[model samples]
Target chain A: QVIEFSKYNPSGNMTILVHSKHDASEYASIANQLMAATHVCCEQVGFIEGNDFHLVMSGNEFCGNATMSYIHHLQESHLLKDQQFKVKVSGCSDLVQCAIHDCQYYEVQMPQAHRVVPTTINMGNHSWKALEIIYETYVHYVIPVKQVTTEIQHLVEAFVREQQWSHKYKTVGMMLFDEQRQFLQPLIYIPEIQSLIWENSCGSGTASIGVFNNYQRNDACKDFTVHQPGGSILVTSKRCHQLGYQTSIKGQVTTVATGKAYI
Target chain B: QVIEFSKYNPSGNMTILVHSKHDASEYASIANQLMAATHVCCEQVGFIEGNDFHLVMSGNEFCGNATMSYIHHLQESHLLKDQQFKVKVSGCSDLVQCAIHDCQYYEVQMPQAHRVVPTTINMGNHSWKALEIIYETYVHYVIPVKQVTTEIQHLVEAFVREQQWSHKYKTVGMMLFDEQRQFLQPLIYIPEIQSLIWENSCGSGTASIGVFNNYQRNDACKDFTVHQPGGSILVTSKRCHQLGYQTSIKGQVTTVATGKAYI
Candidate 1:
């Protein structure tokens, strides 16, 4: 197979994508060995050949960064010339609308966020109403923290494990957000694929936090700015009086590398 | 920078050599990232600038595969016109001889094996004398096993960790030889770097087993075939009363790919 892969560092996650017809989902072990050889923080997903671009991830989870990386590749490569268009990502039922935001940043609208809840989680002698957001398209648990310390990390990590095992989520998005300080740190773990990554930027993670924070404080629609290690993302969402939370995450996607793989 | 890498399958281990002068030795993270992007079982090493094609690896230890990958790259690219020549590897103190055995296979000779000892190790309820082979240029420990099991893997891993922590070897090689079946498996680990790879074919590993096996029962030097999961290697070593063990490892290095990395 003549494989061509492009690597992207959107928010510190070394993400790779191949544009091919080969159902790369079958070669997860090969993908993993390749990833381990590099020793970088990364996740691999591939886009099948088509004008609409069929996205397929071995995890079977909808990934915002990998999706944007593909869209970014299409736009940067001039494969898609229009400023805005709709493309079908395989895992997601909805048609994703992508656009070139300011020519430098490629942004994709994620599936609408729903099932927003504020639950009091008791762990490690501390209790707080952590925001949990989910959708058929995306899922994340967002916690507002004051400072990111070793203790906080350990506590959240244990809680993450507990919730993931009990619920059996393929990919669990555990994010720590400091809205007051304008900083975000995501420690999302995917057990099935064995990926626990500290991403440079997280689109759905930011969206979950921003949307939940906006909904709990007010009923009106608002745009929230969330900062992270990789960069910042703007989350636009508001709680509908009847339907609750509707959200779209927007962020800059930059190319780290472009390459061709000889397989 | 456009980094072109040529992939070589030297006895099953997928090794890639990038032609560069970017001081990649300083970027351990990048080396790993590039390796992961390829999605192949591989190790990433590079060649520095010079007419003789100076070889450099971030690893302080000299590698037989990476060095051979560089030579294979030169021959396949037709940069060096001869079938036989000498090249220098960065960490190795001596020059390396290279030749195209049959145009399809690339083979290289290793430093002479020495310091062979049978040390009795006690673990759990098991105790046996394993051979430890060392060279001014090569280092490895050879253990005999009836079968390769998960339990044996765990046991040997602990011993490997224990040995590495106690002794500061530049890089350590661990091997399991089923010489009766002509099968060998390398469980080389480096603690400081934390790399415990089950390689397809290990040069020093095969050389260690062949030389040690050549020493124990048979008083005369002879050629032996060591089998592994990836492929097999022919090891030639002889023992002399005055000089001890004289050994060299030989294996086929075939090209898997020739590609470019755009960064």
Candidate 2:
């Protein structure tokens, strides 16, 4: 029993199809019941429980791409007429609103508009290390502290070390630092020599640089970009008052491919 | 036989779920393909196609919520450890990142921010008649005369007449317009008393209004708000160039339940 749920936009210009096995009438009844019982307005399409059908429900607050995909399926089935239309979507409470015009193309709404105040963290005496270390930290007051845990610290350290080794193959000259600016590593060619020295804990002696500078505390930036041997990343912070620093790292990462898995 | 695809952002402690399927191996194949195709890129996750089984394709360039959904599913399946590992993502050929440190929270690396420009259009002038009047003269520079045929002219006139009558109800108003400003209609609404007078014109007036207003033209803000018998809509014209005045009489719009308008 392959039930297909199809929903056309308000203007009847587009339709979305979902494979489900739910009863359309039952879903509509439920939506009406929900609306009457909980004062929550819902448009009922088809495929009540799991199969395909068509009905209109709350959609304004959902994912746009998903909606587009639904529309695409509807179009594929020859269910839609025009390429565009309006959707009567339910939003907060029993509030029903009309969403005007569905497009064939994908669109991403911009994040909420707000004024961002720039914040700066003064490194105090650590300012002298700025030129050599390429360090900048500003307080976002939103990062959670748990991100600075021992495990994450180790990961950061390992990543930085790996980047240092890989930097020689690239022409860019650079130095690296963690958000805290406690440690700084320099870029150098000749991996064999550096490897031998690092093996003896006496390579360039920058390995202990973080240990020595670890005591200094500084504010963190809400978002920052750091370049390394691997690539660049944008870091945003969220400070969980109870938990500590929660940092998010975003950048290009290399994944190890282990062949294809056939299901 | 359910398959699902998931990804993580290194920057914001967030994980995004791209797609899910009932088939397991199919899910793994999708993950493998995405991983092998790009390194550290953020826009990797995509939809599941049943025809190919294992071939999953990417959708949009960046998807944050989807990524989170993906991680949640993976964690539930125990494929990941502790739901708190640093995951890197690829975005727009580069790596835009996000992270999920725990179950309740995560962050995403947003691309360089941009500001939206603002522009305004007259709501009263959004009627089909108003549009026809404008297309015949006012907005001629924006539309070519060759595109305006007799059928289009009749449709525009009928729409305008209907819009004038619909507006008499006071509760509903017109929203969208053709490129030549020759047609107008409401996007969505539950027709009540004057339903017959205001029903069934191609682009639901409301949706048309919303689409025109949401997008930007040359140097003008394209986003707008349209009020109708049903409610209000935030119409945006993100990409209006290709679809300006094109109407799909055989598409989605012809199938919507317009209440009295449908009969």
Candidate 3:
């Protein structure tokens, strides 16, 4: 089968947007095949819907980077009615608002964290004092580390593998934060798709970091430029009286390739 | 700029064929950009010119895998006149013959090795008694090993780097041959494009192995199914009085993706 696709690079997080139509039940198998080494290998895959610009992920999970990439895709394809508008995305009930800040830079207003709590996480032989951020469909743990090491990466993998079976979350992530350098190494695991990736850059993880910083600081609004292995993302959070924390992340998303993917 | 491309997996060797028009002087830069991690990353890039089925590599070097890939492309695009035909390739003055065996399997008759000599290769703390297969534009060393090891792989890198500058060759390769299991680990280095790849499957290397085997044995014709990390390729060689040793390698090529690459 041949599927039309457009691959985008959002801060080195490779995403493939499928323009072909298929039954929702077949998405998981198609995604698994297309993401193989011999095919159009990428971190994630999403299917685009009709004229309204709705994105349905392979696992029906919410992805901030893919959301921003879809906004860029809409603009490039002349389908966007306005620069700032809301669009439907998978996993989230509310329509997400996104905008094009510049040629390649994009902004997406993300859903606020449902809950935040500080806790101690122990896995294998290591214990870490981390902050947990809960969302509608996923959970993210931000662990402050002196430095990111391979050992810690393996530990995070082990922890996630153990926690996934017990948790109902569709996605779980570990954000290894280095405060001194403002660097974040994000590791995401999707249990439904059986994908664990040390992502180049993660938008939702950046938003969680911004929300966590706001809870610890006295500033009403702040912008934190989080550096990652691929590039940096600007995450801004504003505290409102009744609205809680309004968080958003902005990054560069380039439409790198458009083609027919044969699986 | 956008470049039209078709990515093919020929026996696990990923090759990108650019179907765009560009000056010959810009091939190197275009190949470098298209082969980036953020772009259409692959082992090699070839440019197809006109409707006559001519292929020009990024470094203007001859490639057996790309030759077979082009033949597959021709058949798929309805450009081939017959099941068997000759096509022009880079780095060679003569046209190459190729044939389609089945749906995905392809065969290419390769150029003969100019010279074959035994020598002792020394680098770092390792030395190996190897056979060198010299081509018109490249050289390949077949080093017999009981087992493939990381230490030996590193030693090959060091040896290739040392020998590349001294020799006036465009390409250099090391085939780690395990006669016990009939396994071949191929590492190719192209100085012109600055590409060093521990390729998944190599066609020229397989042909070289078949040629070397015929030279070592007293057989007039032989077919060797060589095993590699990615997959296996069948290499056949026949020795005659008129021709020293006519060699051909057959493998599978799948058109995995076709698209416009934005570089």
Predicted model with the maximum TM-score? 3
Cα-based TM-score, every candidate: 0.74, 0.19, 0.85
Please provide, for model 1 over B14-33, each residue's C-alpha lDDT reduced to its tens digit, 9 standing for 90 to 100: 67676655765444644665
Interface Cα root-mean-square deviation for all models: 6.3, 22.8, 0.9
- lDDT top scorer: 3
Better of 1 and 3 by TM-score: 3
lDDT of 2 by residue, A1-263 (tens): 22233323321112222344444445444334322211111122222122232223422232222233343444444456543343322222321111112333221121111112222222222211222221111001111122234443343334334544333222111233454532323333233343211111111112112212222334444324433222333333433455533333222211111111111
Whole-model Cα lDDT of every candidate shown, in order:
0.67, 0.29, 0.84
For candidate 1, the per-residue lDDT at A78 reads 60
Name the lDDT value of residue B18 in candidate 2.
36
CA lDDT, candidate 3, residue A159: 82
lDDT of 3 by residue, A1-263 (tens): 88999988888888889988999898999999887777778878999873376899997988888898888887778755546778899887788888876556678898888778999999777788999988777789999999999989988888887764435677788999998899999998988777799988989889988987887674654557999998889898877867777999988778889979988
Pairwise DockQ winner, candidates 2 and 3: 3
Model 2 alpha-carbon miss at residue A23, Å: 20
